[PDB]
Coordinates of C-alpha atoms and ligand atoms in Angstrom, one line a residue:
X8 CA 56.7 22.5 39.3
X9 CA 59.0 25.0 41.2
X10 CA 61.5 27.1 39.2
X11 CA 64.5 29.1 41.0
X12 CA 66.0 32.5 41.0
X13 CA 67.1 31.9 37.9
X14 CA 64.0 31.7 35.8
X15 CA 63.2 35.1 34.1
X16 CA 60.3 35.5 31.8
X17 CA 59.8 34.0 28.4
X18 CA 59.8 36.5 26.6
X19 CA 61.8 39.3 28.8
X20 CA 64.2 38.5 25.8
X21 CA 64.5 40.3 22.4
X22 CA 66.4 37.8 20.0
X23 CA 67.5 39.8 16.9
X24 CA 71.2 38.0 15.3
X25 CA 71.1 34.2 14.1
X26 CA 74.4 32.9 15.1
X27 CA 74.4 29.4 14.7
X28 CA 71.9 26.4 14.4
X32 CA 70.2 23.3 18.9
X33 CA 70.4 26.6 17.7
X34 CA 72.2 29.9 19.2
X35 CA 71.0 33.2 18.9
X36 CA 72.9 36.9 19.8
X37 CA 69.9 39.4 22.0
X38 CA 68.7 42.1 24.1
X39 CA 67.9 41.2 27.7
X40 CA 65.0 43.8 29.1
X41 CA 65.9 46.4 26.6
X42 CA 69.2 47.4 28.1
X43 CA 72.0 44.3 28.5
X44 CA 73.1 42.0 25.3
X45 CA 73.3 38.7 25.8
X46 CA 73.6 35.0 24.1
X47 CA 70.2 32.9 24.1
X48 CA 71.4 29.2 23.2
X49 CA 68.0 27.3 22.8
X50 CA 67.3 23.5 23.1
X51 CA 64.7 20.9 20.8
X52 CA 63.1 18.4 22.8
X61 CA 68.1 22.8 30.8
X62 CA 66.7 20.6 33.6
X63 CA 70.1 19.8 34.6
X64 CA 71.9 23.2 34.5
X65 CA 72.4 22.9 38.0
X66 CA 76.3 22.6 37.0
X67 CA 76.0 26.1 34.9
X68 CA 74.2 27.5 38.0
X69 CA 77.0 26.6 40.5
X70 CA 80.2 27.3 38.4
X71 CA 81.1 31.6 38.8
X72 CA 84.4 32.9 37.6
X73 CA 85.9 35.3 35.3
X74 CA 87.1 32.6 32.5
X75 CA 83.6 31.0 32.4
X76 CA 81.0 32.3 30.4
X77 CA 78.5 33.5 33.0
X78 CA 75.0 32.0 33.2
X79 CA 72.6 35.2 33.4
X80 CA 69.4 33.1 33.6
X81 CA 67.4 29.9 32.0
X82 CA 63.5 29.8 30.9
X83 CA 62.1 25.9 31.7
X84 CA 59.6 25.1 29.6
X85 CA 60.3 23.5 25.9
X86 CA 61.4 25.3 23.7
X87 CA 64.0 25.8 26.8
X88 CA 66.3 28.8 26.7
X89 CA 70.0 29.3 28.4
X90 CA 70.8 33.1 28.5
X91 CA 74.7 33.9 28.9
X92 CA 77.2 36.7 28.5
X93 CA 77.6 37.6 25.0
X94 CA 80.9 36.9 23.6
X95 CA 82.3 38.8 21.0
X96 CA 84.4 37.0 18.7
X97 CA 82.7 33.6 19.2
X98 CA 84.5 30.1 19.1
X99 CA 88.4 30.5 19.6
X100 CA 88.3 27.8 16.9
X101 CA 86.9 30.2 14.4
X102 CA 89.2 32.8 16.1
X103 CA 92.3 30.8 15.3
X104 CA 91.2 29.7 12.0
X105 CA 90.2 32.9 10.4
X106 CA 91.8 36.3 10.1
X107 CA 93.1 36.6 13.3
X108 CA 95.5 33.1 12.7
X109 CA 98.2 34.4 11.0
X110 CA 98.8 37.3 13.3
X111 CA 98.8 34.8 16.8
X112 CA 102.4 34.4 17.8
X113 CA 103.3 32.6 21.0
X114 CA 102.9 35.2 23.8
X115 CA 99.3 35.2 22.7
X116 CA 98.9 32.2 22.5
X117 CA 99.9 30.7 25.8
X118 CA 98.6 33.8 27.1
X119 CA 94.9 32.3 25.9
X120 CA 95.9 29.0 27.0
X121 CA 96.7 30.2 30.9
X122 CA 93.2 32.1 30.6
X123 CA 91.5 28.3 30.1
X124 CA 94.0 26.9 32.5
X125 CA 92.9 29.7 35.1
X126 CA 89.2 28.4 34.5
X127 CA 89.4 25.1 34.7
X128 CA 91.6 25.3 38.3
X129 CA 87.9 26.9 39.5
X130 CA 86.3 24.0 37.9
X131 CA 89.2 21.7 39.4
X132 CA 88.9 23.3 43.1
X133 CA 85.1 22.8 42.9
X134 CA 84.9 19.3 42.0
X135 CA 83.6 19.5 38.6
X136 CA 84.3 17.8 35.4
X137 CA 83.9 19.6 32.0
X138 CA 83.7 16.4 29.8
X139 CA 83.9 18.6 26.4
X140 CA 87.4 21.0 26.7
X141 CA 88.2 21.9 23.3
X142 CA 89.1 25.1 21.2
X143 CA 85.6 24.7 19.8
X144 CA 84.0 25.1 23.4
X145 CA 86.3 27.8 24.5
X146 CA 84.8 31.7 23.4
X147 CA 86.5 34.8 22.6
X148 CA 86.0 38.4 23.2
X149 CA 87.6 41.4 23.1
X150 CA 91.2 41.6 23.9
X151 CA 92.0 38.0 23.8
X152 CA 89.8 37.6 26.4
X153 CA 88.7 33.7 26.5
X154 CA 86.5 31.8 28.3
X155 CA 85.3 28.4 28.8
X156 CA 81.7 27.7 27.8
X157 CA 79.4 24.6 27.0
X158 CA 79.0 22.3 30.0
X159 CA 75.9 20.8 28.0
X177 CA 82.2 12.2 19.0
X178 CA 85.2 14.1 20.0
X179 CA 87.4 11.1 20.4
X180 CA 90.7 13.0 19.6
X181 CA 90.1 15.3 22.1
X182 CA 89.3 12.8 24.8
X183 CA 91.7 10.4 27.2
X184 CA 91.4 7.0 26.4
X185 CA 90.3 6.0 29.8
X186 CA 87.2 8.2 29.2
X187 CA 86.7 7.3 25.9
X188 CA 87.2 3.3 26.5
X189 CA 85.9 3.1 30.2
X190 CA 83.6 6.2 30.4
X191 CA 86.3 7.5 33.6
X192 CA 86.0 11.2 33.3
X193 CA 87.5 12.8 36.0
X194 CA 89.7 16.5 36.1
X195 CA 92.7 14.6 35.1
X196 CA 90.6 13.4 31.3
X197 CA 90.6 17.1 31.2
X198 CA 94.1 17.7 31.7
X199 CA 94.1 15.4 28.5
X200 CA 92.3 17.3 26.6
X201 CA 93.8 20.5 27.8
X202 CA 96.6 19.3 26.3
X203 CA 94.9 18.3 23.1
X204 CA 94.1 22.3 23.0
X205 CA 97.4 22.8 23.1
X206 CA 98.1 22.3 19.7
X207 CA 95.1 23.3 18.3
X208 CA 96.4 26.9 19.6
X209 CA 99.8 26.3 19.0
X210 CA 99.2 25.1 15.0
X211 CA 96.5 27.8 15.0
X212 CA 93.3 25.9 14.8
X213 CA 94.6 21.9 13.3
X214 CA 92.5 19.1 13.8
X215 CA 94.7 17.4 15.9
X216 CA 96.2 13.3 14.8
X217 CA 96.4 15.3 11.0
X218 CA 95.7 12.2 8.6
X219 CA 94.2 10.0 10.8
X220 CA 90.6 8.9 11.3
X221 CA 88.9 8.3 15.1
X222 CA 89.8 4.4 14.9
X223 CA 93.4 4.8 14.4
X224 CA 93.9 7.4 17.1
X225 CA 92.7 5.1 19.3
X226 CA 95.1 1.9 18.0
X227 CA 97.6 4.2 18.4
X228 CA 97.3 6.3 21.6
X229 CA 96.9 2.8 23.3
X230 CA 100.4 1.5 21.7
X231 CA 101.5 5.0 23.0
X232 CA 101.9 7.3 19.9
X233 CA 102.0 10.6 20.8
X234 CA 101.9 13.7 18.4
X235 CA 105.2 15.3 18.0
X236 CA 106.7 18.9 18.9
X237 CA 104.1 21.2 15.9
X238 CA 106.5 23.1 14.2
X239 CA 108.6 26.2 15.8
X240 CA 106.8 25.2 19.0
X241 CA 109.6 25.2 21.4
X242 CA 110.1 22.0 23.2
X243 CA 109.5 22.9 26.7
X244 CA 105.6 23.4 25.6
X245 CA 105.7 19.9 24.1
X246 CA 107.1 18.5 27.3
X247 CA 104.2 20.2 28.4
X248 CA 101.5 18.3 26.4
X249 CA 103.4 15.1 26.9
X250 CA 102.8 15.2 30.5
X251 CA 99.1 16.5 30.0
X252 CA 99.0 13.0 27.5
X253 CA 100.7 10.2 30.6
X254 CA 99.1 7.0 30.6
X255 CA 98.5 7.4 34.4
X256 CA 95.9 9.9 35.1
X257 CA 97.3 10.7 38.3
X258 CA 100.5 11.5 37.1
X259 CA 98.6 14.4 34.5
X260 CA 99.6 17.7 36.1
X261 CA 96.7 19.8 37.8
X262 CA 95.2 23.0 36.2
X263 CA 96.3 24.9 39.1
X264 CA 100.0 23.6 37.8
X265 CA 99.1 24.7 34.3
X266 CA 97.9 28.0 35.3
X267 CA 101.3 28.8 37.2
X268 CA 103.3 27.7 34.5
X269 CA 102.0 29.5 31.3
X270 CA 101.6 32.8 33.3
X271 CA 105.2 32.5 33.8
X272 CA 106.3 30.9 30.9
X273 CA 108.2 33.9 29.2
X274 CA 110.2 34.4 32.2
X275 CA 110.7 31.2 33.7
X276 CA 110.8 28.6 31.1
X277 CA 111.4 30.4 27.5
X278 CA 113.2 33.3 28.5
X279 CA 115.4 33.8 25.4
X280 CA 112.2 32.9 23.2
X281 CA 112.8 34.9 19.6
X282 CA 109.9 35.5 17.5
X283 CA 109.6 32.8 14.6
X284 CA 108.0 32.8 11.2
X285 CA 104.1 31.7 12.3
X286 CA 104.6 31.5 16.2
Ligands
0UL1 N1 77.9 33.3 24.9 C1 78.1 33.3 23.6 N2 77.8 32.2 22.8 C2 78.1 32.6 21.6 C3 78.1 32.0 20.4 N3 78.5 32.6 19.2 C4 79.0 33.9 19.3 C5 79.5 34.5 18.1 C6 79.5 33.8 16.9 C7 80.0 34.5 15.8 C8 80.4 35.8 15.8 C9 80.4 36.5 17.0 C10 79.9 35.9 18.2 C11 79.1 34.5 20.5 N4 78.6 33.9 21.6 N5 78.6 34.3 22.9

Protein backbone atom coordinates (compact mmCIF):
# COMPACT_ATOMS: atom_id res chain seq x y z
CA UNK A 1 0.00 0.00 0.00
CA UNK A 2 1.02 3.64 -0.78
CA UNK A 3 3.61 5.40 1.42
CA UNK A 4 4.16 9.35 1.25
CA UNK A 5 6.95 11.79 0.91
CA UNK A 6 7.96 10.83 4.04
CA UNK A 7 9.12 7.40 3.62
CA UNK A 8 12.97 7.14 3.05
CA UNK A 9 14.72 3.81 2.77
CA UNK A 10 15.15 1.21 5.38
CA UNK A 11 18.23 1.16 5.71
CA UNK A 12 19.37 4.96 4.36
CA UNK A 13 20.03 4.95 8.31
CA UNK A 14 23.26 4.17 10.17
CA UNK A 15 22.27 3.53 13.89
CA UNK A 16 25.42 3.61 16.03
CA UNK A 17 24.42 4.97 20.11
CA UNK A 18 21.81 2.89 22.19
CA UNK A 19 19.97 5.58 24.03
CA UNK A 20 17.13 4.04 25.61
CA UNK A 21 14.94 0.83 25.41
CA UNK A 22 10.15 0.60 22.26
CA UNK A 23 13.52 1.36 22.13
CA UNK A 24 15.48 4.75 20.96
CA UNK A 25 18.53 4.90 19.20
CA UNK A 26 21.14 8.16 18.40
CA UNK A 27 22.29 7.86 14.11
CA UNK A 28 23.70 8.99 10.96
CA UNK A 29 21.10 9.84 8.22
CA UNK A 30 22.78 9.22 4.56
CA UNK A 31 26.22 9.64 5.91
CA UNK A 32 26.06 13.33 6.57
CA UNK A 33 23.03 14.50 9.11
CA UNK A 34 22.68 12.96 12.85
CA UNK A 35 19.55 12.14 13.84
CA UNK A 36 17.24 10.20 16.55
CA UNK A 37 15.64 6.74 15.21
CA UNK A 38 12.84 5.84 17.90
CA UNK A 39 11.72 2.29 16.73
CA UNK A 40 8.41 0.48 17.50
CA UNK A 41 7.48 -3.58 18.43
CA UNK A 42 4.41 -4.81 16.92
CA UNK A 43 3.77 4.72 12.89
CA UNK A 44 0.53 4.23 10.85
CA UNK A 45 -0.96 7.11 12.55
CA UNK A 46 1.92 9.70 12.52
CA UNK A 47 -0.14 11.79 10.53
CA UNK A 48 -0.22 14.18 13.77
CA UNK A 49 3.89 14.21 13.67
CA UNK A 50 3.64 14.87 9.89
CA UNK A 51 1.36 18.00 10.29
CA UNK A 52 2.82 19.67 13.40
CA UNK A 53 6.18 22.13 12.13
CA UNK A 54 7.67 24.62 14.53
CA UNK A 55 10.84 25.56 16.21
CA UNK A 56 9.86 24.13 19.86
CA UNK A 57 8.74 20.71 18.40
CA UNK A 58 11.07 18.16 17.72
CA UNK A 59 11.01 17.94 13.86
CA UNK A 60 9.89 14.78 12.12
CA UNK A 61 12.66 14.17 9.39
CA UNK A 62 11.02 10.94 7.98
CA UNK A 63 9.20 7.41 9.02
CA UNK A 64 10.02 3.77 7.48
CA UNK A 65 6.40 1.62 7.42
CA UNK A 66 7.01 -1.63 7.65
CA UNK A 67 7.39 -3.53 11.26
CA UNK A 68 10.07 -3.13 12.81
CA UNK A 69 8.71 0.62 12.07
CA UNK A 70 11.11 3.52 12.45
CA UNK A 71 10.43 7.41 13.33
CA UNK A 72 13.53 9.48 12.43
CA UNK A 73 13.77 13.06 14.29
CA UNK A 74 16.18 15.84 15.04
CA UNK A 75 18.67 14.70 17.48
CA UNK A 76 18.50 16.35 20.68
CA UNK A 77 21.40 16.84 22.65
CA UNK A 78 20.91 16.66 26.29
CA UNK A 79 17.83 14.36 26.05
CA UNK A 80 14.75 14.42 28.56
CA UNK A 81 14.55 17.79 30.45
CA UNK A 82 13.66 15.40 33.29
CA UNK A 83 17.02 13.94 33.23
CA UNK A 84 18.29 17.57 32.51
CA UNK A 85 16.75 18.82 35.76
CA UNK A 86 17.55 15.88 37.76
CA UNK A 87 21.17 15.45 37.11
CA UNK A 88 24.15 17.84 37.08
CA UNK A 89 22.68 20.58 35.57
CA UNK A 90 19.81 20.90 38.69
CA UNK A 91 21.52 22.60 41.08
CA UNK A 92 22.83 25.35 38.82
CA UNK A 93 18.92 26.13 37.28
CA UNK A 94 17.77 29.37 38.93
CA UNK A 95 14.52 30.90 37.95
CA UNK A 96 15.37 33.02 34.71
CA UNK A 97 16.17 29.64 33.36
CA UNK A 98 13.78 28.12 34.34
CA UNK A 99 10.70 30.04 33.23
CA UNK A 100 12.75 30.80 30.34
CA UNK A 101 12.39 26.73 29.42
CA UNK A 102 8.90 26.85 30.49
CA UNK A 103 7.88 29.89 27.82
CA UNK A 104 9.97 27.70 25.19
CA UNK A 105 7.09 24.75 25.89
CA UNK A 106 4.49 27.38 26.21
CA UNK A 107 5.57 28.85 22.69
CA UNK A 108 5.10 25.15 21.35
CA UNK A 109 2.19 24.21 22.51
CA UNK A 110 0.31 27.76 21.30
CA UNK A 111 1.32 26.07 17.62
CA UNK A 112 -0.24 22.95 18.74
CA UNK A 113 -3.13 25.16 20.36
CA UNK A 114 -3.64 27.37 17.04
CA UNK A 115 -3.69 24.14 15.02
CA UNK A 116 -6.22 22.24 16.79
CA UNK A 117 -4.24 19.58 18.20
CA UNK A 118 -4.14 17.88 21.49
CA UNK A 119 -0.76 16.51 23.01
CA UNK A 120 -2.39 14.10 25.61
CA UNK A 121 1.28 13.32 27.23
CA UNK A 122 2.90 17.07 28.34
CA UNK A 123 5.36 16.41 30.88
CA UNK A 124 9.10 17.18 31.69
CA UNK A 125 9.74 13.58 30.67
CA UNK A 126 8.27 14.34 27.05
CA UNK A 127 9.93 17.68 26.69
CA UNK A 128 13.96 17.40 25.17
CA UNK A 129 16.81 19.45 25.66
CA UNK A 130 19.66 20.67 23.53
CA UNK A 131 22.18 22.99 23.55
CA UNK A 132 21.67 26.26 25.11
CA UNK A 133 18.56 25.58 27.01
CA UNK A 134 17.09 24.96 24.00
CA UNK A 135 13.76 22.72 24.59
CA UNK A 136 11.39 21.16 22.72
CA UNK A 137 8.35 19.23 22.89
CA UNK A 138 8.46 15.67 21.56
CA UNK A 139 6.40 12.37 21.83
CA UNK A 140 2.94 12.74 20.36
CA UNK A 141 2.84 8.76 20.39
CA UNK A 142 -0.34 5.98 33.68
CA UNK A 143 0.57 9.47 34.17
CA UNK A 144 -2.33 10.31 36.34
CA UNK A 145 -0.58 13.18 38.19
CA UNK A 146 0.17 14.89 35.27
CA UNK A 147 -3.33 14.59 33.78
CA UNK A 148 -6.77 16.88 34.51
CA UNK A 149 -9.28 14.95 36.13
CA UNK A 150 -11.75 15.42 33.38
CA UNK A 151 -9.31 13.53 31.11
CA UNK A 152 -8.35 11.11 33.42
CA UNK A 153 -12.11 10.36 34.80
CA UNK A 154 -14.09 11.12 31.43
CA UNK A 155 -11.45 10.55 28.76
CA UNK A 156 -12.10 14.75 27.76
CA UNK A 157 -8.78 15.71 26.47
CA UNK A 158 -8.95 18.84 24.92
CA UNK A 159 -5.93 22.00 24.88
CA UNK A 160 -7.29 23.10 28.10
CA UNK A 161 -6.28 19.13 29.84
CA UNK A 162 -3.05 20.44 28.56
CA UNK A 163 -2.96 23.63 30.16
CA UNK A 164 -3.33 21.20 33.23
CA UNK A 165 -0.60 19.50 32.76
CA UNK A 166 1.36 22.52 31.74
CA UNK A 167 0.91 23.49 34.93
CA UNK A 168 1.88 20.21 36.48
CA UNK A 169 5.39 21.01 34.54
CA UNK A 170 5.54 23.78 36.35
CA UNK A 171 6.77 22.47 39.40
CA UNK A 172 8.57 19.73 38.11
CA UNK A 173 10.91 22.80 36.72
CA UNK A 174 10.41 24.97 39.45
CA UNK A 175 11.52 21.97 42.32
CA UNK A 176 13.98 20.85 39.66
CA UNK A 177 12.72 17.52 38.52
CA UNK A 178 9.94 16.38 41.85
CA UNK A 179 7.46 13.95 41.14
CA UNK A 180 4.75 16.07 41.71
CA UNK A 181 1.77 15.22 44.91
CA UNK A 182 5.37 14.24 46.89
CA UNK A 183 3.95 11.31 49.27
CA UNK A 184 1.11 10.39 47.58
CA UNK A 185 0.13 7.44 45.43
CA UNK A 186 -2.17 7.78 42.00
CA UNK A 187 -5.48 6.99 44.11
CA UNK A 188 -5.12 9.70 46.52
CA UNK A 189 -4.35 12.42 43.99
CA UNK A 190 -7.38 11.67 42.56
CA UNK A 191 -9.59 11.76 46.05
CA UNK A 192 -8.01 14.79 46.53
CA UNK A 193 -7.81 16.89 43.34
CA UNK A 194 -11.68 16.10 43.17
CA UNK A 195 -12.19 17.54 46.94
CA UNK A 196 -9.99 20.37 45.46
CA UNK A 197 -6.45 20.04 47.02
CA UNK A 198 -4.07 21.76 45.19
CA UNK A 199 -0.20 21.60 45.71
CA UNK A 200 1.15 24.57 47.42
CA UNK A 201 3.62 27.51 46.51
CA UNK A 202 7.34 24.85 46.09
CA UNK A 203 9.64 26.56 48.03
CA UNK A 204 11.35 30.18 47.13
CA UNK A 205 8.98 29.96 44.13
CA UNK A 206 7.49 33.37 44.20
CA UNK A 207 3.82 33.55 44.43
CA UNK A 208 2.83 35.11 41.28
CA UNK A 209 4.11 31.74 39.49
CA UNK A 210 1.96 29.70 41.87
CA UNK A 211 -1.05 31.93 41.07
CA UNK A 212 0.05 30.77 37.86
CA UNK A 213 -0.34 26.99 38.25
CA UNK A 214 -3.47 27.59 40.19
CA UNK A 215 -5.16 28.89 37.33
CA UNK A 216 -3.51 26.28 34.88
CA UNK A 217 -5.25 23.65 37.84
CA UNK A 218 -9.36 25.56 37.76
CA UNK A 219 -12.01 23.05 37.96
CA UNK A 220 -13.53 24.67 34.73
CA UNK A 221 -11.61 23.94 31.77
CA UNK A 222 -12.67 26.88 30.08
CA UNK A 223 -11.54 29.11 32.67
CA UNK A 224 -7.64 27.40 32.26
CA UNK A 225 -5.72 30.18 30.51
CA UNK A 226 -4.56 29.54 26.78
CA UNK A 227 -0.85 28.77 25.83
CA UNK A 228 -0.79 31.74 23.84
CA UNK A 229 -1.51 33.49 27.47
CA UNK A 230 1.26 31.42 28.91
CA UNK A 231 3.69 32.28 26.29
CA UNK A 232 3.12 36.12 26.80
CA UNK A 233 3.41 35.89 30.33
CA UNK A 234 6.76 33.95 31.07
CA UNK A 235 8.56 35.89 28.17
CA UNK A 236 7.79 38.87 30.23
CA UNK A 237 7.79 37.71 33.50
CA UNK A 238 11.11 39.42 34.82
CA UNK A 239 9.79 42.68 33.78
CA UNK A 240 6.25 42.61 34.18
CA UNK A 241 5.41 40.45 36.99
CA UNK A 242 8.70 39.74 39.20
CA UNK A 243 10.56 42.73 38.59
CA UNK A 244 12.36 43.07 41.90
CA UNK A 245 13.02 39.11 41.82
CA UNK A 246 16.50 38.60 43.95
CA UNK A 247 18.28 35.44 43.39
CA UNK A 248 17.54 32.79 46.25
CA UNK A 249 19.36 29.84 47.56
CA UNK A 250 18.12 26.89 44.82
CA UNK A 251 15.94 29.15 42.48
N1 LIG B 1 15.00 13.30 19.26
C1 LIG B 1 15.65 12.79 20.30
N2 LIG B 1 15.19 11.78 21.04
C2 LIG B 1 16.12 11.57 21.97
C3 LIG B 1 16.19 10.70 22.99
N3 LIG B 1 17.31 10.72 23.84
C4 LIG B 1 18.33 11.59 23.64
C5 LIG B 1 19.44 11.60 24.50
C6 LIG B 1 19.47 10.78 25.63
C7 LIG B 1 20.58 10.81 26.49
C8 LIG B 1 21.66 11.66 26.22
C9 LIG B 1 21.63 12.47 25.09
C10 LIG B 1 20.53 12.45 24.23
C11 LIG B 1 18.25 12.50 22.59
N4 LIG B 1 17.12 12.45 21.77
N5 LIG B 1 16.85 13.20 20.76
Amino acid sequence: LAKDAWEIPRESLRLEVKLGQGEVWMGTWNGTTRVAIKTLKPLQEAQVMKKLRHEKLVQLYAVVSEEPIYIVTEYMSKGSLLDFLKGEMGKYLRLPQLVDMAAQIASGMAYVERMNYVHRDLRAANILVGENLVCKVADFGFPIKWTAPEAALYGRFTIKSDVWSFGILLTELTTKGRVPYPGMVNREVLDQVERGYRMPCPPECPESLHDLMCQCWRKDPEERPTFEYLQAFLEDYFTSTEPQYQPGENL
